[PDB]
Symmetry: C2
Subunit: 292 residues, 2 copies
């Protein structure tokens, strides 16, 4: 019941070891359209294929790629990467903005925004039959602006209609993650269908625990570390493994490796007493629940 | 010495009757990339061809199209319109933003922004040999923000290196047009190489005259009218014809006709005592000077 790029859909129970937040490529759509001389698609493709192959060599079965509007989602690029690797790849829909929406959205309703996400979930992405399996939204240093709130409310409509989960970008040093969770739950989204991202950027463990205690997954998803690993280990030590999702990604708005989790983070956890049942919770059971 | 889409360049003295600010098409790059189902390129092409043909039937020889980053500039679409009509079309470079730049520009210098404009002027647009003949920039209700100022300063660098003129979008109800003119002239741009646009939206004639008196062209370029025609006529009556540029465009950020000037504005002017020497000043001599 999870759509996959270039493949038939799969049951959530079969997702296996999952990297929940990794971008194959990211760019600003208007800059790439206007100044293509700044970009090399062939290098981007080779890098993405190599990274996915490296992840598969460490046992990754599924990658969730939350590149959406604002970060250059390209479903045809994603399909080429799948053809070259055989990875299960989950694409999403959504909008990443920090202040205002593009000019297109002037005088358009929240429902019209939600209809875009629902189109991608139910019909397909960018004129293909590859469907979106989650909604991605953001807020950062400017906080919850008028347009940021519109996108959050549209994500809630899409989740209520289609049941796909919601992944967020937040700024770990303000309350944007807590606000995203509150607005979405007030609109009727199940808290366990939300992943509040980019929380590994803060050592304020009480803030992180507050979000998890309210029922949502917490994205310790900036790996690339000790303070992050310390915070991660402390959160694990304190019993929060069933809310933790771990990734590297580095933010797609930035126009390190996808296996640094295997070379740095997981070893560090293991040598500090984290057993293999916790690793399986974080990388298999938590994504299965999120997508269930 | 003016580059033309799909043609050899022309001397500025041969530009003839010119429409200084008309968009063949406009859209938000990220929305079109992400949701192509919202758009019909074949309808857009038919509309653009018909509009250009209608303009040519009224004697227009050259159209300046200030669609740039933020409004969906597409040099290959423009070339198809030229092939279908034979119009002289001047394309530009630049960036239209009201608050912040796309994520690409985080931690990038003004010089790097200017290098993009200079690339389009000296090398070509979007991988073609069609070159940009002017720079287009904007500011609106948020005023001169940090990123808006960066783009203005980059435009000044591009003009100083290449001598192409600068067209602006401004908000007629604040001082953004006056501020654009001041910042550009402080950076060494000749005032007569600047067109401050969207001033037809205000009846504050003293503000408009202040900009013209400082040496820049004033864009009475929102046609589509009486109050605009009244303001235009009053400005003509007061001796400002040699600073007036007239167009319709309607702003490209809006994702009426290009001949409404011939069906409404020019007739109205003529029947109110405006002779044919003024019409020639506004539509032939002023563009020739601007591009000289
Ligand atoms: Co992010
Ligand atoms: Co405008
Ligand atoms: Fe990300
Ligand atoms: Fe315009």
């Amino acid at each position: 019941r999870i759509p996959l790029v270039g493949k038939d859909s799969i049951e959530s129970k079969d997702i296996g070891f999952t990297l929940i937040h990794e971008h194959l490529r990211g760019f600003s759509e208007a800059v790439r359209q206007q100044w293509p001389h700044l970009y090399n698609e062939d290098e981007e493709f080779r890098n993405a294929v190599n990274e996915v192959k490296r992840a598969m060599q460490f046992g990754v079965k599924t990658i969730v790629d939350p590149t959406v509007m604002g970060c250059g989602r390209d479903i045809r690029f994603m399909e080429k990467v799948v053809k070259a690797t055989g990875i299960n790849l989950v694409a999403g829909t959504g909008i990443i903005i920090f202040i205002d929406l593009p000019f297109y959205f002037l005088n358009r309703s929240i429902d019209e925004i939600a209809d875009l996400f629902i189109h991608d979930i139910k019909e397909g992405i960018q004129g293909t039959l590859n469907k979106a399996g989650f909604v991605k939204i953001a807020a950062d240093e400017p906080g919850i602006t008028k347009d940021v709130e519109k996108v959050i409310k549209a994500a809630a409509i899409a989740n209520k209609e289609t049941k796909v989960p919601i992944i967020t970008h937040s700024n770990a040093h303000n309350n944007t993650g807590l606000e995203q969770q509150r607005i979405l739950t007030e609109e009727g989204v199940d808290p366990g269908k939300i992943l509040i991202g980019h929380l590994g950027d803060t050592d304020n463990i009480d803030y992180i625990k507050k979000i998890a205690d309210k029922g949502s997954f917490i994205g310790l998803d900036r790996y690339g570390v000790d303070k992050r690993n310390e915070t991660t280990l402390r959160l694990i030590k304190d019993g929060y493994s069933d809310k933790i999702m771990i990734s590297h990604d580095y933010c797609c708005t930035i126009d390190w490796s996808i296996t640094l989790i295997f070379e740095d983070t997981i070893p560090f956890l293991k040598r500090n007493g984290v057993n293999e049942e916790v690793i399986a919770t974080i990388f298999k059971e938590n994504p299965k629940k999120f997508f269930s």
